[PDB]
């Protein structure tokens, strides 16, 4: 974990002592106090629970039970029972009648055709209620306590030993605009897509409240009428199409435990911890200097940023000075807060959002600093 500096906590003349820390996933923040064991606090999981279904989108349809009806000129329109039943796709047209096809005169005869629509493979779409975004914080000594938080319920308080009663006021900060997005499910797999990207799909859809498949003509073809007959074809599968279009969109891993919870990879939680009156200990870290190197090179994140992993040899516990410049001054944005390494020969993550175009990421100071080239469009 990573201990808090002095400015990160404040002890009052009266009342209690408050801590302020922005905790991010896969990392941990520890708080120390004289004559007391350490308090380790971490953000374990940020999840979504059963987001409401909005619209299914059929990408593979199957036609069944075919019926065609005929009317000779001046005998009116052709009517099937299946025109009323919503299960069936129906077309109305007119055919070339005459002698060869047993009518009474020459001209266009009304012909109607219906077939039962059955959706073989569909794509579900879910809305995310942001006031329901769950996040879980674990806090243990060195006697564990697990704290289930909601986006709405940001204030959760917990009993302890020595530290007494704590009260945590926490806010959630999402990695991606969930009001411009959909959670999309296709069989075993799922992704985060644009709302508009789905709303602009040319496939048949069915609202979350159920109902009939709409605009069935996207996957059904009614070939030109003949004498008294029409060939109807269900179009081919379109899985390859969606799957190819679903590439440029990050996937969302399913849960191993509950298997109905969606885990967000990014995002962070900002916390204010109300504590009893007690004196903590502020570890003041030193900006790293000596040998560092890339465990994992800077690589794209699929949402406009880039993540790297570095290791330190000589630097003890030390802050890592990450900056992205065009010698000059940086123009980028350091995503990762407290980029600090606890133990030598230990790997650490650094995320960053560079300026669009060509820029250089610089990590560390002096000879032993690291430099990486980066382009962004």
């Amino acid at each position: 974990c990573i201990g808090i500096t002095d400015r990160d906590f404040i002890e009052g003349v009266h009342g209690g002592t408050w801590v302020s820390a922005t905790l991010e996933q896969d990392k941990c923040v520890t708080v120390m106090a004289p004559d007391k064991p350490s308090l380790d606090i971490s953000l374990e999981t940020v999840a979504i629970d059963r987001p409401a279904e909005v619209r299914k989108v059929c990408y593979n349809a199957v036609l069944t039970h075919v019926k065609i009806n005929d009317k000779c000129p001046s005998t009116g329109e052709a009517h099937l029972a299946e025109e009323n039943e919503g299960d069936n796709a129906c077309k109305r047209t007119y055919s070339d009648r005459g002698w060869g096809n047993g009518c009474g005169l020459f001209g266009k005869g009304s012909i109607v055709a219906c077939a039962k629509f059955t959706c073989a493979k569909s794509m579900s779409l879910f809305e995310v209620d942001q006031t329901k975004i769950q996040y879980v914080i674990r806090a243990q000594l060195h006697d564990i306590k697990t704290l289930k938080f909601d986006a709405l319920s940001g204030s959760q308080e917990v009993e302890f030993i020595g530290y007494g009663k704590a009260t945590l006021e926490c806010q959630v900060q999402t990695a991606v605009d969930f009001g411009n997005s959909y959670i999309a499910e296709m069989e075993t797999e799922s992704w985060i897509v644009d709302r508009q990207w789905a709303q602009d799909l040319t496939l048949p859809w069915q609202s979350g409240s159920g109902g009939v498949w709409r605009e069935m003509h996207h996957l059904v073809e009614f070939e030109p009428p003949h004498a008294a007959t029409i060939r109807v074809l269900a179009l081919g599968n379109q899985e390859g199409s969606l799957k190819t279009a679903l590439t440029g969109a990050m996937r969302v891993t399913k849960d191993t435990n509950d298997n109905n919870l969606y885990k967000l990879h990014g995002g962070h939680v900002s916390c204010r911890v109300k504590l009893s009156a007690l004196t903590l200990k502020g570890t003041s870290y030193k900006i790293c200097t000596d040998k560092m190197f890339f465990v994992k090179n800077p690589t794209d994140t699929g949402h406009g940023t880039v993540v790297m992993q570095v290791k330190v040899s000589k630097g003890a516990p030390c802050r890592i000075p990450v900056i992205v410049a065009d010698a000059a001054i940086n123009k980028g944005i350091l995503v990762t807060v407290n980029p600090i390494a606890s133990t030598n020969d230990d790997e650490v993550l650094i995320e960053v959002n560079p300026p669009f175009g060509d820029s250089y990421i610089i990590v560390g100071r002096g000879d032993s600093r690291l430099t990486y080239q980066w382009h962004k469009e």
Partner: antibody
Amino acid sequence: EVQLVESGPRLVKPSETLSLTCTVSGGSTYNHHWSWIRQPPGRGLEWIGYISYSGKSNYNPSLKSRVTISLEPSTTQFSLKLNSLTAADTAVYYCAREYRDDTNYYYYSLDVWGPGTMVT
Amino acid sequence: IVMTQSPSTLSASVGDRVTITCRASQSIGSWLAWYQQKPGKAPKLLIYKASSLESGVPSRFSGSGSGTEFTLTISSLQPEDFATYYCQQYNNYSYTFGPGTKLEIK
């Protein structure tokens, strides 16, 4: 909407001829096979035979010798002719359509039926 | 070609999973249809092509079979279903009916 209705004389003297007429309403008699069936009260159904528009008819082997079925595409009413008739023929006579999709191989049926005529 | 049904008579209760059998004089593939006629009216088509169903038939009804033997089934018997049931043959030419199993209340 498609419906079938048969008619004629509901009372005939033995060893004579028979003239039933199945009029087809709400549909074109260009398609399908146009079929007749009978049912002697107390007993079940026996398939009599069918006729295409083109005129390729086909009858039940036990009766063909005494049966003619004509097809008028004009007035849209296919008709049944049973000569040398006896009291065994006294029954209910349904005119029904078989089916033909052809362009799709969705085939099998006897779809629309008439109420049937009681012939003696 | 001749069709034979078994039973010809049945006494069942509203809810019974009833099963009527129908066998042909030879192999006719999957070509077989069932019919439901209540006394007075004209026969009404229920099943077509062995197992496929016609729009207008309750889902309790279910047929199966290919080749030589075919069966009907009503999952949970219902009032209107008390009727006489027939079967059909294809030949590629000349068709044939069955004797008809009369369904009757217990």
